[PDB]
CSV table of C-alpha atoms and ligand atoms in Angstrom, one decimal:
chain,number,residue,atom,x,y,z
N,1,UNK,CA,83.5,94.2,82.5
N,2,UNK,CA,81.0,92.0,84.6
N,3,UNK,CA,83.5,91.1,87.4
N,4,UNK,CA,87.1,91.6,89.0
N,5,UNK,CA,89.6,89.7,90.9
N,6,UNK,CA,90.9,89.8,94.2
N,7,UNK,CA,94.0,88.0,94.2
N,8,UNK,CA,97.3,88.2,92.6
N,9,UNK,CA,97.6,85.0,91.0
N,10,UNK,CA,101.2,84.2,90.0
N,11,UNK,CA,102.8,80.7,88.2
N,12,UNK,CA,106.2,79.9,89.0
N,13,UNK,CA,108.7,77.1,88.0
N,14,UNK,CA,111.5,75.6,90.5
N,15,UNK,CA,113.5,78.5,89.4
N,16,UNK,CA,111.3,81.3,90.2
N,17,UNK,CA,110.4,82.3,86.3
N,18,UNK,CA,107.1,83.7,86.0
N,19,UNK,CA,104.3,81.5,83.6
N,20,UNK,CA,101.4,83.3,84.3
N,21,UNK,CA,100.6,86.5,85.5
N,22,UNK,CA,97.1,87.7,86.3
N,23,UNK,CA,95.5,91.2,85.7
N,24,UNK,CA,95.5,91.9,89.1
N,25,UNK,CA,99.0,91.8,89.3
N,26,UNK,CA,99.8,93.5,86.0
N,27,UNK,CA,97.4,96.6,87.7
N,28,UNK,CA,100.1,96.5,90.7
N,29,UNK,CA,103.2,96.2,88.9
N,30,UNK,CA,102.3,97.9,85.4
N,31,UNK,CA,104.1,95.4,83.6
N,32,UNK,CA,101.6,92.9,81.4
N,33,UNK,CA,101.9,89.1,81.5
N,34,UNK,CA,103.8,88.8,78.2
N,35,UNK,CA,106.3,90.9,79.5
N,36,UNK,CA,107.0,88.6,82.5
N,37,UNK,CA,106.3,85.4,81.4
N,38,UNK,CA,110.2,83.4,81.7
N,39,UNK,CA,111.6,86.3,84.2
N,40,UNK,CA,112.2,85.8,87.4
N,41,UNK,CA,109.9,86.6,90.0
N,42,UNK,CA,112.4,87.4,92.9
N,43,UNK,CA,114.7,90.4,91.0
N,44,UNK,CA,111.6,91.6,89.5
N,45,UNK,CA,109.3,92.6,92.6
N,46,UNK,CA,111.6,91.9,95.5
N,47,UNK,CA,114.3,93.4,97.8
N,48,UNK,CA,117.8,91.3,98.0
N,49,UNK,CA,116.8,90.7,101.6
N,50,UNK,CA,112.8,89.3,100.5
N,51,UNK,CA,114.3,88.1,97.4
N,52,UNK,CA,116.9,85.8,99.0
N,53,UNK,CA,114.2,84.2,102.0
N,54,UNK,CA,111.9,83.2,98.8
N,55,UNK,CA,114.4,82.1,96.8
N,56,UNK,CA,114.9,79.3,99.0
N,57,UNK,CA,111.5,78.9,100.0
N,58,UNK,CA,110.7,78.2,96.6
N,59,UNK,CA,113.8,76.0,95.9
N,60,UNK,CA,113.0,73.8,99.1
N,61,UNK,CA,109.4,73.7,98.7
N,62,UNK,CA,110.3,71.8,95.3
N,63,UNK,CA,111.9,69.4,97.4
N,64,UNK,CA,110.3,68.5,100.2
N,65,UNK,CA,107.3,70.3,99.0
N,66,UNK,CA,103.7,70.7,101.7
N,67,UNK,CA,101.5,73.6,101.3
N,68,UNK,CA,101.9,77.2,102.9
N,69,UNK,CA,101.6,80.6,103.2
N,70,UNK,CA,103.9,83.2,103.5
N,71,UNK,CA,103.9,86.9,104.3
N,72,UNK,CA,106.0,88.7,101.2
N,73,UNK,CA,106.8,92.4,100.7
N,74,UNK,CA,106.4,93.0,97.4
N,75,UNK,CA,107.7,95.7,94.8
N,76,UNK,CA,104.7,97.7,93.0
N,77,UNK,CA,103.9,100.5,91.1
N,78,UNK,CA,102.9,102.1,95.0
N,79,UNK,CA,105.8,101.4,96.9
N,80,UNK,CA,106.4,98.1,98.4
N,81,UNK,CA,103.1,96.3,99.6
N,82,UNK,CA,103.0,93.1,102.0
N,83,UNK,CA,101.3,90.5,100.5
N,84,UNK,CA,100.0,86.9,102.2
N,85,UNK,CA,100.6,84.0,99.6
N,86,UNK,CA,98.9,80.9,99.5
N,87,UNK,CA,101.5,78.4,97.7
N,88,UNK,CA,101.1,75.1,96.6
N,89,UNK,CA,101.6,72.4,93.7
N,90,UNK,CA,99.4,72.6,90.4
N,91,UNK,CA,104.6,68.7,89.9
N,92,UNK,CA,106.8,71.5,87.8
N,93,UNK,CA,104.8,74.3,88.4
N,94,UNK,CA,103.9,76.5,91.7
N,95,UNK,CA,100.8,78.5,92.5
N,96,UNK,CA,100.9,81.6,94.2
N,97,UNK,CA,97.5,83.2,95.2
N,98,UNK,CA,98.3,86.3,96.9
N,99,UNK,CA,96.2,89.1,98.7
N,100,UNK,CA,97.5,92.3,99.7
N,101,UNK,CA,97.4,92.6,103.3
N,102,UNK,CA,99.2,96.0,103.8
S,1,LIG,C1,104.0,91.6,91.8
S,1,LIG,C2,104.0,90.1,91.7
S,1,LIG,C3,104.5,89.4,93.0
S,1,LIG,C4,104.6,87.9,92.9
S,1,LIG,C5,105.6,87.2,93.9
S,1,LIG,C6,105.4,85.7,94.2
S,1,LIG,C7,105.7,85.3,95.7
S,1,LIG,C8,105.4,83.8,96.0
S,1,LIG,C9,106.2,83.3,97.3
S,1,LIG,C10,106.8,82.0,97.1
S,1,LIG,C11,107.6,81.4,98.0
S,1,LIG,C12,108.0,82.1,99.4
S,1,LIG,O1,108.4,83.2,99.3
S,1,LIG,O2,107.8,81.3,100.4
């Protein structure tokens, strides 16, 4: 294996359902991309509280959507872990590029 990544890279639709799922983030969670791939995002790895704030992130940002980053405390394998995503349009589908910042 030549090379790694750095970022958790996750594809989302308006409603939150996962559509791809990189390695990095199957090495935090333990869970591979097949086994995501239509769940949703927000019961998966987040807290009602984080859960309910992204929720409608996400929902609004498919409305009157600009690009953005948000700070997200995320549910791993570790513990939760605070991670900065960069999100923006590919419009159906939403990019996620996250980096652990705990
Ligand atoms: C362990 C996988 C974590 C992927 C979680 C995706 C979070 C992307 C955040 C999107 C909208 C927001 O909250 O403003």
């Amino acid at each position: 294996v030549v090379s790694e990544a750095n970022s958790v890279i996750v594809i989302l639709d308006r409603h939150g359902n996962i559509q791809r799922f990189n390695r990095l983030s199957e090495e935090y969670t333990g869970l591979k991309e097949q086994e995501v791939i239509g769940q949703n995002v927000f019961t998966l790895f987040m807290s009602p509280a984080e859960a309910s704030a992204s929720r409608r992130n996400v929902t609004g940002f498919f409305r009157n959507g600009s690009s953005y980053e948000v700070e997200r405390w995320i549910k791993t394998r570790k513990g939760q872990r605070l991670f900065l995503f960069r999100n923006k349009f590919v419009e159906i589908f939403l990019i996620c590029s996250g980096t652990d910042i705990t």
